[PDB]
Design a protein around this ligand. Structure first.
Ligand SMILES: CCCCCCCCCCCCC(=O)O
Ligand SMILES: CCCCCCCCCCCCC(=O)O
Lengths: 121, 121
């Protein structure tokens, strides 16, 4: 759920997730997708497309277990849907950290309604 | 200072530092040293002996800079004493994470005044 997602982002990046990524660009955080602005935003585009394959579970509210083991995110067993959910979230947290070099503060609080429409996943 | 030390322990172990290590065994956290109970406690014994070499700065209150860069603690330049300080702190955080497998909850709130005296550093 959002609680696990946010924790993973903090562990990987060292940054407060709500603040750095809760409204970044056209795809990170609240709302749906749009044309990416940069590589951090493209990480969040892939992540939202990752959620589209999740069958019956709720990406926003279902909790799942994972542990931070030798500084790596390891998705616990859980059920089929929660496992894929955890795997979506781990991959966006790693991608956000990988692209910290190009993170741009000007997109931090982006006006999402003016984004160009996104391509189909 | 304590703020950097706690943050490093959280980043490496994923655990709330105050709660897990603020009074652990005979050497972690408050107070001085004593005979170690286990490997977590020996990490904190080494750490406090690391602090004894620093007489030109204050391990508890002086701030210093460091960054979490690709999930590794990197001590910033700072001055001679703060650099060594950062280096003591980085090594205890890594040691505490390495010995998480044997962490024992029975020593979490240890009665330190009954510890056997420690060997000289
Ligand atoms: C410790 C953090 C508590 C939960 C905060 C959750 C905030 C999630 C931020 C989502 C942005 C990333 C993106 O959309 O993938
Ligand atoms: C985010 C944490 C805020 C600062 C909390 C500092 C607690 C430091 C705990 C010391 C225990 C480790 C030992 O003695 O090395």
């Amino acid at each position: 759920s959002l609680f696990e997602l946010g924790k993973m982002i903090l562990q990987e990046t060292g940054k407060n997730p709500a603040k750095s990524y809760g409204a970044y660009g056209c795809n990170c955080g609240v709302l749906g997708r749009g044309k990416p602005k940069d590589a951090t935003d493209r990480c969040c585009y892939v992540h939202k497309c990752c959620y589209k394959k999740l069958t019956g579970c709720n990406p926003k509210k279902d909790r799942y277990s994972y542990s931070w083991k030798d500084k790596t995110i390891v998705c616990g067993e859980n059920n089929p849907c929660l496992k894929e959910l955890c795997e979506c979230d781990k991959a966006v947290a790693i991608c956000l950290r990988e692209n910290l070099g190009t993170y741009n503060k000007k997109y931090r609080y982006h006006l999402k309604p003016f984004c160009k429409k996104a391509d189909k996943c």
